[PDB]
Every structure is written in structure tokens, then in C-alpha cells.
DNA sequence: TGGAGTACAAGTGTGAGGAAAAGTAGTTGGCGAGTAAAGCAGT
């Protein structure tokens, strides 16, 4: 319900839904072949809030823009 | 021959810890000179 929805999205989600598309396609890429392509600054997991939108940034509140960049690693 | 359970191995009930950017403080600092006349005191 839109009344107090509290949607559960994190940067751990956008890798997890990117891992499941790899096993339905039956790919040899894994979470060792994801954490080696994100912590080596290859696909934009880290620092995503700050450089990606460039026009949609400013009206987003402070705790929401905190979650969308690559804050920690999982 | 057949049970007391006591063990590890399965479960589900009970609130909180850590994350962080903008926004918000107490605090300095850095401003806007004459020639004349009449008056009523004066004595």
C-alpha cells in the first residue's frame, strides 16, 4: 500500500538481481566475478549517487542519496 | 525388548545497531572679516 510503503531497496539489491540474471542465462560469472568487478571500480556499484544522474540529483533527500552510492561493500 | 531423555539440530518469537548527507548550531569577524545705527538699560 502507498500508505507507509517503506520500500526495501539497497545497493545489495542491484547486485543480487544482477546475479540472478546470470544463472538463468547460465553464465560463469559469479559473486567472486562481481566483487572483483565492483571493488576494482569497473561496473558502477561504488559512488553511484554522485556522478550518475547529473540532473535528477538535487531534489532527492539526504538519507536517500546516502543509500544509492556505494557506501560500503557487502 | 522396549522405555526415562539429552543431546545437537533443527526451528520461530523479541527491537535495535550503524550509515550519512544536508541542514543547524555557538563561535569570531567585519561592516555600514566691516560701518553702521537706536534701544534701554545705566547713574
Residue A8 Cβ < 7 Å to strand B: no
SS3 of chain A: helix, strand, coil, percent, to 5 = 35, 0, 65
Q: Which of A52, A9, A16, A13 is nearest to A34 (CA)?
A: A16
Count of CB atoms situated within 10 Å of the CB of A24: 7
E-strand ranges in A1-74 read none
Are A29 and A22 spatial neighbours (Cβ–Cβ below 8 Å)? Answer: yes
Q: What is the resolution in angstroms? A: 3.5
Are A35 and A73 spatial neighbours (Cβ–Cβ below 8 Å)? Answer: yes
- List gaps in chain A by the residue before each (C–N > 2.5 Å): none
Instruction: Please name the residue whose C-alpha is nearest to the C1' of nucleotide B20.
Output: A66
Q: Compute CA distances A65 → A20, A32, A49, A51, A70, whole Å.
A: 26, 27, 6, 12, 10
Residue A62 Cβ < 7 Å to strand B: yes
Are A43 and A22 spatial neighbours (Cβ–Cβ below 8 Å)? Answer: no
Amino acid at each position: 500500500p502507498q500508505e507507509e510503503l517503506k520500500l526495501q531497496l539497497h545497493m545489495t539489491s542491484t547486485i543480487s538481481i544482477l546475479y540472478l540474471a546470470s544463472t538463468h542465462l547460465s553464465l560463469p560469472v559469479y559473486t567472486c566475478d562481481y566483487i572483483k568487478w565492483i571493488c576494482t571500480a569497473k561496473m558502477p556499484y561504488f559512488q553511484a549517487s554522485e556522478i550518475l544522474p547529473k540532473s535528477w540529483r538535487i531534489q532527492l533527500p539526504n538519507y536517500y542519496v546516502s543509500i544509492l552510492e556505494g557506501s560500503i561493500s557487502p
